[PDB]
Each structure stands twice: as C-alpha cells, then as structure tokens.
Design a protein around this ligand. Structure first.
Ligand code: HEM
Ligand code: HEM
Ligand SMILES: Cc1cc(N)nc2cc(-c3ccc(OCc4cccnc4)c(CN)c3)ccc12
Ligand SMILES: Cc1cc(N)nc2cc(-c3ccc(OCc4cccnc4)c(CN)c3)ccc12
Ligand SMILES: C[C@H](O)[C@H](O)[C@H]1CNc2nc(N)[nH]c(=O)c2N1
Ligand SMILES: C[C@H](O)[C@H](O)[C@H]1CNc2nc(N)[nH]c(=O)c2N1
Ligand SMILES: [Zn+2]
Lengths: 411, 410
C-alpha cells in the first residue's frame, strides 16, 4: 500500500512505503485525528520479537541479513533473554540504534544531521557521581568552544523498572525559575517546579534571573543527588541587537547548548531511561518560545515599548514586529560570538532536502507537520506547503513521566 | 472516547463528547496520521433516508421538539417523499439550520464564532445561469454592504441525478486573473492561471492586466457554463498603502474586500448542494501572508525588502520576516482606512478560543484542525497555538468537490 504526499508549492509528489514498517500506534482513529495532541514494566514475553525486529533491521543495514553472524546473534540474544530476561546491545548496535532513534524522530526538523551523532556509551556507570562525570564530558565535547557537535550519552538500561537511571532535569542546561510571593516569576517560568525540587533537596539558590540549575541525577533507582555543572563548561551568549543599542540593556542571555535529558530511548525492546542528547539551537526556539511565549520570559511588552510601537490595538502587529526583532537579536548574538545556530529558513530548507532524500533512499520520512513548521513566519518556509505523513518507527525517543511523580523514595 | 484537550498556556482542560457523533471519516488510521494532507475529502433511497433521519433528529432536538407531534410527522413525510421521489426537499427552516450548522462544523475555520449570524439566500427556484447570475450579484451586494461586511450563503438547487448539477466554476466569486508569460513566469495571479485560460478559451476578453477581476462561469441544470461579468460597482477593492512607507503605494497593490468561496459542496441530510457560494470577511494574513508572499502566489517579498534596504544577502537577517510583517501591517491599515471589515490574526484566534470555550460548554465539543486554525505567521504568539484540538467530521458540512471542467460532460 503506497501513499503519496504533495508539495503544494512545487507540485512535487513523493511515494511513501516506509509507513508499512510502522508498528506503534499514532493515537488517531479512523474517525478522529489527534494530530495536535501533545502526548498521545516490560517482560521477557514480548521482548525477543522486539529484539528480532531490531536485529533484522540492523543486519539489513550492514547488508548481512541472514548471514551466519546474523543468525548467531539472534541465537545469542534468545539465550540471554530466556535465562536473564533482558539482553545487552553490542557497541555497534547501540550506535546504530541511537542514530536511528533520531532519524525516526518525526517532530525534529534538524534530522539532516542524524548520521553524525557522537554516541557516548555510559552503560558501565553505577552511581550518581559517575553520571555527573559522564554529563560533564558530554557538555564539554558537545560545546567545543561554540562549534557545537551532536552527541548522546547512554546510561544503563531499565531492568525491573525499580533501578532506573534518570536525569531529573528536562535539559542539562536550564535557567532556574522562582515564584515570588506577589505572583510574579523570577527567571524562567518553565522551570519553577523543578527549581523548588532542587531547593528542597538542598540547593543554595542565588535567586537571580539567569541561574544555571544544578544537575539532579538518579543512579540504579536510588534517591537523586545534586551536582553543580562547572561554570566554565556552560557557554552563554549575551543577547544584543545589531541596530538597537538599547537591546543589550535588557540584560538577556541564553546558553548555547540545547541538551534534552528527560526522554526515553527505546532500542530492540530495551528502555534507556537516561539518555541526554544535544544538538544546536534553531534560533526561534530561543527567540519565539523561550522569551515571548505568554508562559515564559514575556519580554515582548518591554521590547515593543522600547521600539515605540502602537501598542493600543493588536492590529498594529506590534507583537509580530517585536518578535521578529528579538529573533534577529538572537541570531546576531550567536553568530557574532561564533556559537553554532541555525535560522528557521535554513533549517526548514535543509529538512525538505533531507525529507526528499529519505523518500528516495528509505521510502519515507515520518514527519509531524504541527511540530516541523516553525513557530513564526510559517508559510514563508518551505515546510508549510509540504504534506507530511506521521507514523511511529523504532528505534524511537519516547516521553516518560517526570520521575518525582513515580519515584519511590529511599531517604 | 470521552476525550480531553489541554491548553498548555493556561492549563485549561476541556472534555469532548461531541466527537462520538462524528459520522464521516478523517483519513487517519491507527498506524498513520494524515492531519497535514490537503485533500482526503449518485445516491440512493437506501442511504438517503438514514441521512435524512439523522439530520431531522438533530434539527428537532435543536428546537426542543424531539419525539414530538411535528417531529414524527416530518419523519414519515420525508420517508414518504424519498420512497416516492428518490429524494426530498428541505423546509426553509431546516435549510437555514442546515447551512448554519455546516459553517459551525467547518473544523478548518477560525471565524466560526459568527456561525449563527449567517444570512441564507434560498435560490432553489433558480433554473438558468442568468438567474444564477442575478442571485450572485444580489449576494455580493448584500454581503459587501458598503464595506460593512455581512456573512451570507446562497443555495442553488440540489443535485438530482448528477447530470443536472448547478456549479459555479470559479473557486471564488471575486478573483484576479492570471496570465502565463511567453518569456518569464506569471502576471496577475498564479493561482488562477488555468481558470483564466478556461475563461478566455471559453470566450472571455482579458484586459491582460495585473488585477483583472475574473468573470463568473455559471452552469445551470448541468448545461454548458456561461460567462458573466460582475458589475464593477459591486466589486469593492482596497488599494494597499502603508502607514509609514510612502513608497508602498508605489507598488500598485490592491485587494478585493469580499472573500466568497464558490466551489465547495454543501451536504445537508444527505442532499448535495453543488453550488452554494458563501462569504464572510477576511483575516489580515489571508491577503498579506498567503495571497501576496507565497512562491505559489504574488511573491512580492523580493521587492518590499529591497525598498526597505534590508540585508538580503543571508536568510539569517530575517528580512523575509521583517518584510512579511510590514506587508500585513499595510493590508490591515488599508482595509481599516477605507472602513472595509477585516480582522487581524490575534483578534480572530482569541475570538476562536472563546468560541471553543462556548462549544465545549453548550455543545460538548468543537471539531478543530490545528494545521489550518493556526495563522501562517506568528503562530506561537496567538492563543490557538498552545490549544490542543480534536479533528472529526460532523454533518451538515461543506466539502470539496472536483473541478467541473474535468467532470462536466461538455
Ligand atoms: C543538531 C541540530 C538540531 C536541531 C537544530 C534540532 C531542532 C529541533 C526542533 C526545533 C525541535 C522542535 C522542538 C520545539 O521547537 O519545541 C526538535 C525536536 C526534536 N528533536 Fe531535534 N534538533 C537537533 C538535533 C537533535 C538531536 C541530536 C536529537 C537526538 C539525538 C534530536 C531529537 C529530537 C526529538 C526526539 C525531538 C521531538 C521530541 C518530541 O517528540 O517531543 N534532535 N528538534
Ligand atoms: C466571517 C468571517 C470569516 C473569517 C474571518 C474566516 C476565516 C477563515 C480562515 C482563516 C480559513 C482558513 C483558510 C486559509 O487561511 O487559507 C477559513 C476556512 C474556511 N472557512 Fe471560514 N471565515 C469566515 C467566514 C466563513 C463563513 C461565512 C463560512 C461558511 C458559511 C466559512 C467556512 C469556511 C470553510 C468551510 C473553510 C475551510 C474549507 C476547507 O475545509 O478547506 N467561513 N476561514
Ligand atoms: C536535541 C535538540 C536540539 C534542539 N535544537 N532542539 C531540541 C528540542 C527538543 C524538544 C523536545 C520536546 C519538546 O517538548 C517538550 C514538551 C512536552 C509537553 C509539553 N510541553 C513541552 C521541546 C520543547 N517544546 C523540545 C528535543 C531535542 C532538541
Ligand atoms: C468564507 C471564508 C472567509 C474567509 N475570510 N476565508 C475563507 C477561506 C476559505 C478557504 C478554503 C480553502 C482554502 O484552500 C485552498 C485549496 C485547497 C485545496 C487545494 N488547493 C487550494 C483556502 C485557501 N488556503 C481558503 C474558505 C472560506 C473562507
Ligand atoms: C500542507 C498543508 O496541509 C497545507 O499547505 C495547508 C497548511 N495550513 C494551511 N492553513 C491555512 N489557513 N490555509 C492553508 O491554505 C493551509 N495550507
Ligand atoms: C497543542 C500544540 O500541539 C502544541 O502547542 C505544540 C504545537 N507545535 C509545537 N511545535 C514546536 N516546535 N514546539 C512546540 O512546543 C509545539 N507545541
Ligand atoms: Zn491524525
């Protein structure tokens, strides 16, 4: 069953056959679409089917499907599952798996880079202090004095679900957020709950607007522990605007390394509950979402004010005009400081090229239009007119609930 | 099955039960979502009466006469008519309810807060294209209302056996012509190049300008279509200037005030109305974002940025975004200056959230298509962006139908 998608700006039509290899359900039923819904414990019983599927996929990619090395590996994985209930990936399989988890991430516009992921095997790690050391080295490697490099660090896999490794932070590098008694928020409103958890665990909060949060790290199902990332490893960029000299006086800055750490990596039925991964920012992620979203820093007002815009009626498009300016500032500051960033025009262009190539050589590219389209200027980017098919392929990155909602506390 | 949608900007959560009434299918499956595909959209006495029953059931419930005197009488009365005529006719009251609820169910429409204020013109007594033309001119004049725009629909006779279809071949009642060039690309409007050819190739005398209002191509009772020029005095147009940039009027841009879609199919109680032009008023971005800046369209961003002396050497300077905002500021400014109704995307999306609020409270749900509701600029600073939505097809409904020239047995 072949399916077509059309690019309504170029009349380019592509044929998807890769969705046939889809297994996991999407959330949409025959009579309802949940395409805009944000978020729509494992035994030996179902594991070897998942292991076999992954291993078949793996050996196909190395052109050894049905070879002796392939059959022996299936045999080997079979025996380790029946006697030990789980199994261990080889280094070759872990790297393939983590790369393809990114390749399958249908909400990720930066996937042209998927094959250049640097995979750090941290499966020998046993303690929170060891996690801290592995994460420090990830940050240093990935930052690279501003010449960012994609990397993932993979901590031991779930076993009985009672000894999970978890990074409790949602990203390795994030700014604290403090609810004030008067209802206002100091710093990043997105992190107020996590900040309070950190303070409750004994973090001495400087209580500033741009405080790097501590790491809160759980090894082998134990209670989490706090660690301060060495400040010389946290690369930050002061935000200034090329034409407006008053923009620096807003005193804004942002960190250079986007590194997401709350997600789960699934490979061959194995769940890696601790797997921080990092890339480089698309400019709108900082400029549009992190600063202007009503539930974030909310600087549109002050920017529009200092720009002297008609703020009385929204039909002056003062909000639109301030947002563009803030996003020019973000791009200008990172480029000026020689820290890798990509504008939403370059990144969406690259993704169309990626997507067409994936249809050419893979037969499909799962894509979530609701997420791929940038949050500003959507229709003047080439992905807006591009039809996309969303479906779930494994290996995959999955959501998992926040650990503090599930963790059984030791003390 | 009793699903919930969250707004991630306010944490408001709404429960949807209306989706359980969803009749038609969405084109998604459990293994694959098609929420971004543009178009996944000869009846019989068998399928017809249940469709009629379901419509009349929700109609008589709406007037709180469910299970009553008139309800049962109408049900058998229509049941008698279908068995005897292989179709049936809608009472005026049901026809109005049917049309208002097709708008209400249009899950891609951000302006549905106005759904109940639709003016319905019953043109089912129409028999000829000239008659069609008279009805359309009156529609245009009523809806334009000297710039004080009023929502309206005009409903021509329903399909009978598919050989007697009434069709408006134009995609909109009012649209600028598009002429391909022997040398470069396109002059006029590229969206309408084919239709502009089919007009000339049908008889039209094109002034081959940049803003030539297309004639109407009207087909009655399945006959060959006829050309008609809309009287110029009824086409209200807004010349586009900018409140800061004197050179902006030098671009020689204008746009018409009335958005009036004429190629969709209205389905009520199983009856198909293949000609049902409907109109409201524009959202600002529909003119300045889509109609003026797409590579598929006018693509004037090139020259606006030049006239702003922006750094077009690299995309990372965001000159397209800068020019894009200025174009849409001008469009709003121009329409408002001339007192022609228009809404900005901040106001229309905030209105829509309140509408969603009302539909979940007083109806249990509101089918919504995020891909189409979120405006094509500044998406995440409008409140629809953080609003989870549920997309499902309810009837009565507006539906896509094939372009007639590929279908009409000429
Ligand atoms: C290197 C440059 C990269 C860029 C510019 C980039 C950009 C983005 C953006 C803009 C989003 C949408 C999220 C939002 O805007 O709120 C996204 C989603 C995502 N990215 Fe990438 N990304 C990059 C690399 C990576 C890497 C290295 C990984 C993993 C190894 C990754 C995995 C994902 C996943 C899993 C999602 C969606 C998560 C979900 O389902 O909610 N990305 N990316
Ligand atoms: C009164 C002011 C109205 C406004 C501001 C408005 C706004 C919009 C917008 C922004 C879209 C998306 C199209 C695009 O952006 O390219 C849309 C689509 C649509 N509108 Fe509304 N609209 C209005 C009136 C009406 C009326 C009176 C009807 C019918 C009675 C209607 C039915 C529809 C339908 C059926 C669609 C989508 C068709 C499809 O499924 O593709 N609208 N409208
Ligand atoms: C490697 C990488 C690079 C980059 N440059 N960018 C990235 C963005 C995400 C990402 C994933 C999910 C997200 O969503 C979280 C969420 C879920 C539910 C409710 N709220 C928020 C967000 C933020 N939107 C970002 C993940 C990885 C990214
Ligand atoms: C009454 C009304 C008022 C308004 N203010 N606005 C409206 C916009 C549309 C509309 C419907 C479908 C559309 O889609 C065109 C299309 C579909 C499939 C293939 N090619 C092209 C578009 C343009 N995007 C607009 C329809 C009605 C509108
Ligand atoms: C690919 C996508 O489905 C298509 O281009 C849609 C996207 N969203 C849209 N949204 C609106 N309002 N109008 C449109 O024409 C479109 N086009
Ligand atoms: C409800 C809606 O799905 C939600 O707000 C999504 C929409 N698209 C998005 N797209 C990106 N890139 N990032 C986001 O956080 C979101 N949020
Ligand atoms: Zn779907």
């Amino acid at each position: 069953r072949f399916l077509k998608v059309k690019n309504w700006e170029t009349d380019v039509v592509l044929t998807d056959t890769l969705h046939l290899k889809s297994t996991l359900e999407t959330g949409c039923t025959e009579h309802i679409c949940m395409g805009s819904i944000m978020l729509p414990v494992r035994t030996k019983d179902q594991l070897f089917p998942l292991a076999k599927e992954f291993l078949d996929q793996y050996y196909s990619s190395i052109k050894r499907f049905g070879s002796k090395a392939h059959m022996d590996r299936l045999e080997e994985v079979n025996k380790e599952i029946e006697s030990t209930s789980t199994y261990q990936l080889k280094d070759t399989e872990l790297i393939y798996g983590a790369k393809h988890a990114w390749r399958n991430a249908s909400r990720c516009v930066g996937r042209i880079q998927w094959s250049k992921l640097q995979v750090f095997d941290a499966r020998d790690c046993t303690t929170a202090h060891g996690m801290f050391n592995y994460i420090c080295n990830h940050v240093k490697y990935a930052t690279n004095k501003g010449n960012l490099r994609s990397a993932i660090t993979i901590f031991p896999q779930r076993t009985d679900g009672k000894h999970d490794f978890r990074v409790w932070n949602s990203q390795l590098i994030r700014y604290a957020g403090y609810k004030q008694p008067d209802g206002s928020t100091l710093g990043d409103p997105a992190n107020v709950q996590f900040t309070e958890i950190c303070i409750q665990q004994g973090w001495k909060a400087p209580r500033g607007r741009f405080d790097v949060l501590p790491l809160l790290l759980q090894a082998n199902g134990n209670d989490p522990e706090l660690f301060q990332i060495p400040p010389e490893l946290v690369l930050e960029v002061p935000i200034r605007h090329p034409k407006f000299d008053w923009f620096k006086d807003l005193g804004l800055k942002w960190y250079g390394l986007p590194a997401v750490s709350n997600m789960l990596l699934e490979i061959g039925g194995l769940e890696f509950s601790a797997c921080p991964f990092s890339g480089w920012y698309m400019g709108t992620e900082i400029g549009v979402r992190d600063y202007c979203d009503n539930s974030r820093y909310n600087i549109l007002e002050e920017v529009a004010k200092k720009m002297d815009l008609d703020m009385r009626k929204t039909s002056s498009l003062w909000k639109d005009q301030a947002l563009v300016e803030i996003n020019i500032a973000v791009l200008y500051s990172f480029q000026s400081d020689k820290v890798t960033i990509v504008d939403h025009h370059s990144a969406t262009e690259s993704f169309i090229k990626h997507m067409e190539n994936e249809y050419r050589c893979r037969g499909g590219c799962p894509a979530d239009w609701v997420w791929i389209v940038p949050p500003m200027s959507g229709s003047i980017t080439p992905v807006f007119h591009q039809e996309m098919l969303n479906y779930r392929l494994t290996p995959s990155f999955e959501y998992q609930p926040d650990p503090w909602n599930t963790h059984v506390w030791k003390g």
